[PDB]
Every structure is written in C-alpha cells, then in structure tokens.
C-alpha cells in the first residue's frame, strides 16, 4: 500500500473522453425541452411528491450524479437560473455541444490550453458582436414590456395564459422599486411572494395590491371587513414573558401572591392602552398574543392577528408603508398603518385568509395563484418566476436582442469573418466555436419537426446577407422568419450570461485531465 488504499485514479485522454461523454449526456437529456414547441417534463422526487416543469434548472436540480463533471454542469445550470431565470432552457445544451465539437480537437493532439485561449478570444468577440446587434428600448412603454414577457414565456405551460401572465408580471415588478437609493433604486424579488391555493381556475388568479396572510382572526368580535384600517406591527410578543435573568420570588404575606398575579395582568393592560393611545385598528405580531390582551384590544374594537412569519411581517410593513415596532411604549404615529385601502378576511373554502388591498402606493405585493392542483401551480409559479426575473433584467438593461437563434447566426458569420482574417493554429478552434453555436436553432427545428439540414442551410445562407440580422426560426411553422414581425425578443443580459457561463464551462472542463476518489474527510 502506498497512496490511499481504495482511491481510484484515471488519466489522460481517457479522462477527457469520459468528461466529454458525461457533458454530452447531460446536454442530451434536456435537448428536447427547449423551444416554444417544447416538451413537458415531470419528476419523481426522492420523498414522494410529483414535480412537472419545463424549466431546465429544476429538471437538473432533481438529478443526482456520480461522475463529477456532470455535477459541475448541474451547478452551472443552477447558477444561470438563479441569475437570469431562463436561458437554462438552452445554456447546458449549448455548453454540451460546445464541448462536443471541442473534443474533436483533442485527437488532433492539440493541447487544451491553446484551444482555451481561442475560446477566450471567441467570448470577447461574441460579446462585442452581440452588443453591436442589440436594440435599446423604452422601459415605460407597457405593451412592449408585455411583448417581451410573452416572448420569454412562450416556451412553458403558461403560454395559453399569456395575457394574464404578462399583466401579472408587469404589475408586480413595476410596483416594486425602493426609491431610497436616490436615482439608483433597486427592485427585489423576495417581496414578490407567490401563494399557491388550489381550486378555481388560472383566470381567477390575479395581482392583489397587498399581502396574503394564511391566518385568521383570533376572536369572533373583531370585524372582518374594514375600509381604512390602521395597522401596528408588534415584533415583540404581546404577553407576559420570562424574566430573562432567572429571577425568583419569595413571598411571605398572604396578599402577595394574588398581588403578583395581578401585576402581570397590569403589565398586559399597560401594553394595551399604550397601543390604543395611537388609535390603531390592526394588530400584527410574529409572536403569540395573550388572550387577556386579546380581551383589551377587543374592548377597543381592534383586529389582532398572531404568530405570522417574519418575512410575511416585513412584506405587510412594506405594503402599508408602516415600520415594524418591538416596543409598545416606544410606538410612534409614524409607524401607524396608513395606506391600507381595505382590510378583509374571506373564506377560500375551509380556510380563512387575510386581504389587505388598495394601498395608496404599495411597494410590496404578493401574487395570488389559483389553479388546479399544487404541482401545476408550482409549475405556474416557476414560470412566473422566470418571467418576472427577465422583466427585472430589462428594468436593469433596456437593451434587447433578436432571439430565435438569429443572434446566434449573426455571431456565427461574424466569427467566421474574424477567423478567415485570423490565420493561425487557433483558427480552427475559433470557427469550431462558431459552428458549435449553430445548434440552438437546430434544436428548435427538431423540436418543431422539420427538415433540419435544409432549413439550417437556408438560414445560414440567408444570414450571409449583411442587410438583415433579424432572420430567425419560427417555433411552430419551422420556417425562416425575420424576427421583427414575429417579435420573439429577449433581454441582452440573458444571452450575455448565457454565452459567458457557457465558455466558462468549456474552459473549466477542458482543463481537467485526471480523477481521484475516496478523500474520506
């Protein structure tokens, strides 16, 4: 025994071929999932549930692997999804085909590093080219935004609900802008809560100008319907609490016991009139609520809700503009819940809910998803996540790119020109990258079901013409279509991060040349 006693090793071209095979398989298991013609994939989770979704990221996230490079690709997919939402419908496919053409230069005995340098030059030129072929677009103009969203979503199940989806996403994203950064305000996608409630139909789902609380009134008396409520956020518990410093009491005289019993009652009262001094209407807390304080608030005709999740508290506060408070004696009218157009408690069926709508200028909002069943609802919300993500990306960058593979073909002939002007050994890898790019439109074609070779040739030949870069591939017709009238547009940053992570995947995998197992630590 020398090295580690049951740690395997493998070396060289075998390792490179194995990793390339793994990457190719990873790409392959998803190649059918892309495109407006896309398939619909469903998963068997380890612990019983059912998950069905087109989105590649979730598909891969429900994959465990043994070969490592596959795990690397998995993480790559999850990163791209996190950053941009979609493109993962394409990113891993592009990376896999990139690698597949890449390996062809290994048996050329072409050492990897020079190919890597070629890839880096390729990425630089691709970024430049895409920036040259963008289109800036207004952000205020609503219907163009809706068109963008429809374009980015007409690949998953929500397509037939495109109008509702686009309106939902636009409404949600537009009204989430924390202007406190001067003119550099940032939107956030953790206040845009998504709630899945079964029953009803997709058409019933709508944007609620407020928050959803899956709780109920603590006592019968509090009114379940209020026009202009005032809201107080009590982060602290509203009841008598442990003396944190392990206090103790040693009474001697009879009255003392009943007196201390009265004292906690009195403290509860103190908190109660401290609250009511501000003339509130609504009491919210993440902690519990004493039934005695509940009594006093009832006597003041004040609605109280108990034990709500902290994130939910934050969202409510952002909804009615008030700020959370943990000290009733330190309560300030500046945190009065002004800005709640209506307080209500309905029944969805066997369960109460809390509606706080019609805020003056709500900055927080949750979306009410009402469909058929929790798994389809989860698919819907994943699609909504992707849509609202790309919408926010647009609100960060007003630059757009013609998708449908059109940009890909533009990049293709651009790199072809650079290559034929760029003599050297690295030339062949460069044009190899160019050719590898061509497969996104290809996959579009097969998922459509048309003559892939002739269609692709017509596309490429069409795109040698300088006068037009907007020629792309229609999802359903399977015919060459200029993208402008078709209107499938995408945010620039999407496709940027797409290629960028792709070539990173390429370099990271191509540098690998050996395997070692069994670390046991």
């Amino acid at each position: 025994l020398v090295l580690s006693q049951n740690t395997k090793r493998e070396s060289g071209r075998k390792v490179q071929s194995g990793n390339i095979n793994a990457a190719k398989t990873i790409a392959d298991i998803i190649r059918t999932c892309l495109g407006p013609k896309s398939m619909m994939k469903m998963l068997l989770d380890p612990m019983g549930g059912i998950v069905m979704t087109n989105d590649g990221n979730a598909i891969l996230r429900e994959i465990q692997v043994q070969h490592p490079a596959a795990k690397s690709m998995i993480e790559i997919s999850r990163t791209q999804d996190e950053e941009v939402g979609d493109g993962t419908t394409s990113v891993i496919i592009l990376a896999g085909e990139m690698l597949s053409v890449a390996e062809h230069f290994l048996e050329q005995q072409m050492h990897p590093t020079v190919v890597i340098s070629a890839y880096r030059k390729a990425l630089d030129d691709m970024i430049s080219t895409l920036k040259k072929i963008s289109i800036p677009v207004d952000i205020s103009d609503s219907d163009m935004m809706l068109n963008i969203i429809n374009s980015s979503i007409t690949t998953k199940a929500i397509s037939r609900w495109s109008s509702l989806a686009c309106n939902i996403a636009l409404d949600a994203v537009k009204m989430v802008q924390f202007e406190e950064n001067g003119r550099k305000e940032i939107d956030i996608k953790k206040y845009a809560r998504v709630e899945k409630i079964p029953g009803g139909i997709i058409e019933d789902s709508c944007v609620l100008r407020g928050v959803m609380i899956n709780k109920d009134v603590t006592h019968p008396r509090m009114r379940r319907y209020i026009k202009n409520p005032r809201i107080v956020l009590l982060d602290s518990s509203l009841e008598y609490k442990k003396g944190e410093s392990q206090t103790d009491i040693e009474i001697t005289r009879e009255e003392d016991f009943t007196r201390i019993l009265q004292m906690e009652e009195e403290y509860i009262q103190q908190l109660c009139e401290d609250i009511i001094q501000l003339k509130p209407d609504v009491v919210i807390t993440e902690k519990g609520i004493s039934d005695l304080a509940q009594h006093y608030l009832m006597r003041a005709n004040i609605t109280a809700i108990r034990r709500v999740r902290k994130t939910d508290n934050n969202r409510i506060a952002r909804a009615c503009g008030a700020r959370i408070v943990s000290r009733p004696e330190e309560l300030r009218e500046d945190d009065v819940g002004t800005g709640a157009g209506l307080l209500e408690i309905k029944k969805i069926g066997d369960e109460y809910f809390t509606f706080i709508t019609d805020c003056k200028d709500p900055k927080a909002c949750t979306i009410l998803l009402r469909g058929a069943s929790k798994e389809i609802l989860s698919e819907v919300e994943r699609n909504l996540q992707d849509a609202m993500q790309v919408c926010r990306n647009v609100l960060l960058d007003p630059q757009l790119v013609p998708g449908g593979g059109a940009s890909e073909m533009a990049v293709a002939h651009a790199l072809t020109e650079k290559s034929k002007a760029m003599t050297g050994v690295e030339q062949w890898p460069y044009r190899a990258v160019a050719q590898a790019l061509e497969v996104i439109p290809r996959t579009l074609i097969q998922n459509c079901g048309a003559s892939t070779i002739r269609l692709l040739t017509s596309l490429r030949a069409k795109h040698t013409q300088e006068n037009c870069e907007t020629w792309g591939v229609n999802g359903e017709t399977g015919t060459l279509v200029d993208m402008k009238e078709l209107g499938i547009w995408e945010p620039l940053a999407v496709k940027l991060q797409t290629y960028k992570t792709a070539v990173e995947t390429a370099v990271l995998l191509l540098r690998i040349d050996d395997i070692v197992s069994g670390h046991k630590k």
């Binding site: 612990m47 019968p220 003396g243 009943t258 058929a372 069943s373």
Partner: protein, 525 residues
C-alpha cells in the same frame, strides 16, 4: 440515456411513459367508475389498522387506497382540491380525465403529435365554457329548489330514505344560516355524532350540542330557562410565569398562604356568582357557564353551591357557535362583566350515552348556529354519513352562492356533445380531431350512469342523443328505465360551480399529462 449518468436511476421514454400514464389513468377510472350514480355501489375500505370505511365519495378512495403510479397521485391531489371546493364530481373528474386520455391515445396512436390535440382541447374548452355559461338556469332561493338540489347530491351517497330524511335537516340548516350575504359553513354547522339508536333518526337540532358533560354530582342535569356565560379565562388554578416558590415559618401561616393562593380564583368565581345572583334573583331561571379552559374542583364546589352549571374545555370554535346561537358575549376579563353580556337559551339539559357525556343547548330565539347531530348505529356509518353531510352542505353552499343551477343527469353533457360536434373546422383543421375526441369523452357521464344502472350503453346513448325540435331540450338519462328525461322537470340538478370547475380542472390536467414523455427517478439513496 441518463443511465450512463446514473446507474440506479430509472427512466422511460416518450411512447413508453405516455403509455404508462394512459394505462394508469385507465385503470384508475375503471376502479372508480362503479361509484357515480345513485344506483352506484359504495365501497368499503379497510386500513391496515383494521379500521373500516363504507364510502362512495371517490376522494376518500383515492386518498385512502394507496397507489404508487405517479399520475395516480397527481390525479388524487387534483381531486382533493376539487373536494375542498365542491364535494362530488371528484368521481366525475377522474372519469373525465381517464376517458379523455383514452380518446387522446386513440388519436395519437394514429401518429398525431399530442400538441395538436392539446390545442384542440383548448378551443373545445372555450366553446364548451361559453355554452355552459349561457345554458345555466338562473333560479332564486326557493326552498323546494334547494331541497331538490340536496336530494340529487345526497342520493349519490346513501339509502334513498336516509337522504330523504337528511335533506330536510340540511335545507333547514342552510336556510337558518344565511345573513343574506355570506355563509361560512363552519361555525353555524356543528357536526357531532353519537353512537345511538339509528342512522335515520339523525336530525337537525335547532341549538348547539357540546361534546362533554358536568364534572360534579350536584350539577343539575336539566335547566328550564338558561342564561349562558361564555368565557375562556381559567377558573382552574395557575401559578405565575415567574418562579414564585415561597416560604413560611408557622404552620398557621401555611394555612393562611393556602387561603391566599386560592383567593384569586375565589375572586374570579365570586364575580360570576354575584352576576348570577344579581340577574337570577328569580328562582326559576338557570345559569350555565362554558369555559374553553378547565375548571378547578374547588371552583366546581363553589358554582355547585349556587346550583350553577359549568362546563370546561370546549373546542375553540364552540364559543363562536354559542355566540351565534344564544347571542352571549364571549368575554375574557370577568372584571368587566355585565348582565348585558349574557346569553339566553330556551332549554339546556344533559344527555348521557355510554360512558361519554353530551350537552344540549335548545330553543335559541333567533339561532344563527346549529348542529347536525348524527345518530349512528355503527361507527363506520357515522363517518360515511358525515362525509355525505359535508358533501350536501358544500353543494347547497355553492347553490346559494351562484344564482344559477345546472340540470343534473348529464343533460349538460349531451348538450356539450351536440354543440361541440356542431363546430365546423373553424379550428385550424387538425385540431378538429382533438375537438371530436373531447366531445366524445364528454359523453362518459351518461355512459357510466347507464352502465352502472345496467342499461346497454350504445343504444341508450343514441336514444338520448335526440335533440327533439326547435325545443331541443336538455335531456337527462333515466336512472331506472334508461329513457330520455327532462332533468329540469324531474328536478335533478347540480351546481354550475361544479361543472365549470371540473371542466377547467380536467382540461388543464389532461393537457399537462398528454405533454409528458419520460418519467425519470434519480434521487438520493
């Protein structure tokens, strides 16, 4: 393919997993189709624990017959959502799903790519929804209308006689519930069961019933005229949250501290006693107390010495129910106590059965909360009839909510058939195939009705498939002669909400299922 990635993982492929899903759905619908229809036969399930069911509501079957096929669990979830909305048609929903998928396979097996049939389904659902909206019969809240609706819902579940008995109870309840704008079906509807004397004798009680009895012998069993005190603040002992073990030096002070410790609860009970004696200066009137928490035995003695009925530890919605029954003011702080905060009942007594104890609240002046006291000879029948009761309640709730109502016995379905088939390929042509298939699948409800009722399918379907004239009526299928029937005349109906919801849910489920290709299984060991 993914096998190379992971050896222990499992996949099918497009044709294979599609066949898997259609086969599983077909098997599920075969299992369930025995249920729907009043002539249907309900099912007994036996858990591994030795328990017993005797239901027909499919949701119970799916949730309680353990299956492993994934799409089966998916359909079970959608049916559970359905039941949480309306109550029946879960059977109808699963049958629709299965047979629609059957037709879908019939067509795709002819090489039609499923997405085309998807689009056809979309257009067909649109037209069917339009027709469903236009055909719904707007009817007001006539008592007999609700009676008929309840009977139609109930005869699915039990004896004809049992449903007949229960219908009056349920309709009287619902009538005695509404505050003309919003029923909630929770507080005013108290569902309790006693293992007692019949299944028929189950009947509405105009007041509220409680699931526990007095804890002292001197507790009077019966009270002619009752004043109700609704509260939850402890009348049991309790010790402050802060460590308060105390010391003493003379044994007399030991007794003194015992008295002091009791004194706070003594004050609490004394306030109630003084309230009673102020109000019940008369001898006849009776004072009853309901506590959501417990009552101390010494407190029991105190209240008994004044002849006051008190009950402890009722479920937290029971005070809601008492509020809506006897109009009492549910309070916490006895310190702020008035006669105005009391509740009044025409009669309150105790009924002893077996070892348990029960409490009756009777003759509320204007009761707004009631109880469907379930009498059952057998434990399983209690559960079965309880599910039936909940079904009927939810059905009536939907009926009152929607000012319209749909004629029952599937006349809606033959109407959908004739309307949808009456669509020229105004669709893009290939989708007409899927539309045809969808319309064909819609006809299942009459089909399964006839099959369960014994009549021959094809000939009955053809016979009822006779829209008569310019007055081509909505024709239901007779459930005992297999003959065309005017559902509206015979008064067999169902909620518009039911049909609309089932159509939408089934369309979505089907269009999603027909779009899966492989069913993979790669999870951690």
């Amino acid at each position: 393919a993914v096998k190379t990635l992971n050896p222990k993982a499992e996949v099918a492929r497009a044709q294979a997993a599609l066949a898997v899903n259609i086969s599983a759905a077909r098997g599920l619908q075969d299992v369930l189709r025995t249920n729907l229809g009043p002539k249907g036969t309900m099912k007994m399930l036996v858990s591994g624990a030795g328990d017993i069911k005797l239901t027909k509501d499919g949701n119970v079957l799916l949730h309680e017959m353990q299956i492993q096929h994934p799409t089966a669990s998916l359909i079970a979830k959608v049916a559970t959502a359905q039941d949480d909305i309306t109550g029946d048609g879960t059977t109808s929903n699963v049958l629709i799903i299965g047979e629609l998928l059957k037709q879908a396979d019939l067509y795709i097996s002819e090489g039609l790519h499923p997405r085309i049939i998807t689009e056809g389904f979309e257009a067909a659902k649109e037209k069917a929804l339009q027709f469903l909206e236009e055909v719904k019969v707007s009817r007001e809240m006539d008592r007999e209308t609700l009676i008929d609706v309840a009977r139609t819902s109930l005869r699915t579940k039990v004896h004809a006689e049992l449903a007949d008995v229960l219908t009056e109870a349920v309709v009287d309840s619902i009538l005695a519930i509404k505050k003309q704008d919003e029923p909630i079906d929770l507080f005013m509807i108290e569902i309790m069961e006693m293992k007692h004397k019949s299944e028929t004798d189950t009947s509405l009680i105009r007041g509220l019933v409680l699931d526990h009895g007095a804890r002292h012998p001197d507790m009077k069993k019966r009270v002619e005229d009752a004043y109700i005190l609704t509260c939850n603040v402890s009348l049991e002992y309790e010790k402050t949250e802060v460590n308060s073990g105390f010391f003493y030096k003379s044994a007399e002070e030991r007794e003194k501290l015992v008295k002091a410790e009791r004194k706070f609860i003594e004050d609490r009970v004394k306030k109630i006693i003084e309230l009673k004696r102020k109000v019940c200066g008369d001898s006849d009137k009776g004072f009853v107390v309901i506590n959501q928490k417990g009552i101390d035995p010494f407190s029991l003695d105190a209240l008994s010495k004044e002849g006051i009925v008190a009950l402890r530890r009722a479920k937290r919605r029971n005070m809601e129910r008492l509020t809506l029954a006897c109009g009492g003011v549910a309070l916490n702080s006895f310190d702020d106590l008035s006669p105005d905060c009391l509740g009044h009942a025409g009669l309150v007594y105790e009924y002893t059965l077996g070892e348990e104890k029960f409490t009756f609240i009777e003759k509320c002046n204007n009761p707004r909360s009631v109880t469907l006291l379930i009498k059952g000879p057998n434990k399983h029948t209690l559960t079965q009839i309880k599910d039936a009761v909940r079904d009927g309640l939810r059905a009536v709730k939907n009926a009152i909510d929607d000012g319209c109502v749909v004629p029952g016995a599937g006349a809606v379905e033959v109407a959908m058939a004739e309307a949808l088939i009456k669509h020229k390929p105004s669709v893009k042509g290939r989708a007409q195939l899927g539309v045809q298939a969808f319309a064909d699948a819609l006809l299942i409800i009459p089909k399964v009705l006839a099959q369960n009722s014994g009549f021959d399918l094809q000939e009955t379907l053809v016979k009822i498939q006779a829209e008569h004239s310019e007055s081509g009526q909505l024709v239901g299928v007779d459930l005992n002669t297999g003959e065309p029937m005017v559902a509206a005349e015979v008064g067999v109906w169902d909620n518009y909400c039911v049909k609309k919801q089932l159509l939408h849910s089934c369309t979505v489920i089907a269009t999603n299922i027909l779009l899966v290709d492989e069913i993979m299984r790669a999870g951690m060991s």
